[PDB]
Amino acid sequence: FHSFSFYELKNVTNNFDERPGNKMGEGGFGVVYKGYVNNTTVAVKKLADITTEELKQQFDQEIKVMAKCQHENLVELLGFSDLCLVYVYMPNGSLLDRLSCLDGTPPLSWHMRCKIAQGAANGINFLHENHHIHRDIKSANILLDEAFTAKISDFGLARAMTSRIVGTTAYMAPEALRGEITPKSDIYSFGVVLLEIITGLPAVDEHREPQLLLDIKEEIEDEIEDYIDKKMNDADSTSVEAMYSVASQCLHEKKNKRPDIKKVQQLLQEMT
Numbered sequence: 001f002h003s004f005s006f007y008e009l010k011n012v013t014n015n016f017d018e019r020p021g022n023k024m025g026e027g028g029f030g031v032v033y034k035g036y037v038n039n040t041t042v043a044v045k046k047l048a049d050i051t052t053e054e055l056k057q058q059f060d061q062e063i064k065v066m067a068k069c070q071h072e073n074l075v076e077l078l079g080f081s082d083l084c085l086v087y088v089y090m091p092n093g094s095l096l097d098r099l100s101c102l103d104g105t106p107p108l109s110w111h112m113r114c115k116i117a118q119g120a121a122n123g124i125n126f127l128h129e130n131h132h133i134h135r136d137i138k139s140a141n142i143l144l145d146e147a148f149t150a151k152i153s154d155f156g157l158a159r160a161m162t163s164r165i166v167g168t169t170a171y172m173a174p175e176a177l178r179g180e181i182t183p184k185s186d187i188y189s190f191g192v193v194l195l196e197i198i199t200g201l202p203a204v205d206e207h208r209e210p211q212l213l214l215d216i217k218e219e220i221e222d223e224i225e226d227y228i229d230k231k232m233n234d235a236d237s238t239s240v241e242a243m244y245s246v247a248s249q250c251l252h253e254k255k256n257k258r259p260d261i262k263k264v265q266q267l268l269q270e271m272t
């Protein structure tokens with residue numbers, strides 16, 4: 001990785017201007033700026049609830065994981081440098097933004113949506129094959145290149161029972177919320193993503209009943225077609241029902257009843 005200067009990333013991102021303007025996005029633990037190094041467009045994630053030493057631990061984890069983990073379905077770290085992390089620029093941002101059509105981008109078709117699901121699952125498979133638990137699988141963390149290839153991101157929380165429960169609540173597994181660290185938690189979160197992919201509905205909505213997307217698993221299991229994202233003209237009952245079946249299996253309340261990433265991957269390939 002290239003050891004950048006904590007200064008050469010300032011003038012590439014126009015003195016860290018947080019407008020739509022040099023700011024693509026924002027999350028917890030930091031801000032994502034669009035920089036231009038050499039002839040390469042980059043994503044510089046300046047790190048900013050959590051303590052100062054805890055950002056450093058998440059900075060070093062990110063480096064350590066990215067050093068050994070290289071897959072076309074994982075974003076690539078180019079380097080780092082106050083703490084910065086420079087990544088390959090994803091021209092199509094996050095899956096969350098695309099599902100919401102943020103900044104007027106066209107709605108992803110079901111065809112692309114099936115390819116992204118397979119891409120994301122391959123990315124997770126590499127991580128689990130290499131004995132890594134992501135610990136924060138969510139559509140904001142599934143990035144998209146110019147060809148809409150799904151690239152999983154954010155390995156700061158990743159691990160090769162805990163006191164510091166961390167992650168996104170709307171996506172979290174019951175045992176994860178209780179502080180358990182198992183790759184089975186990642187499966188559960190991927191099932192939430194699968195539900196966002198089918199419905200175009202975000203995992204959490206303040207001004208919506210149910211507020212939590214995963215509560216539709218119950219709504220449909222009691223009373224699915226009614227939830228398919230209407231901003232699609234190319235979806236079909238069989239492939240939609242086949243993706244839902246995977247999400248339903250992923251969303252099993254009991255971690256041990258859930259399928260492993262290899263099975264999920266296989267089931268998503270059986271879709272096409």
Ligand SMILES: CC(C)Oc1cc2c(-c3ccc(C#N)cc3)cccc2cc1C(N)=O
Binds near residue numbers: 024087141
């Ligand atoms: C490796 C990361 C830093 O790269 C990107 C993060 C992006 C985000 C983002 C994603 C997740 C959260 C959360 N939680 C917050 C912001 C939004 C929009 C576009 C993005 C593009 C990139 C990129 N590399 O082009």
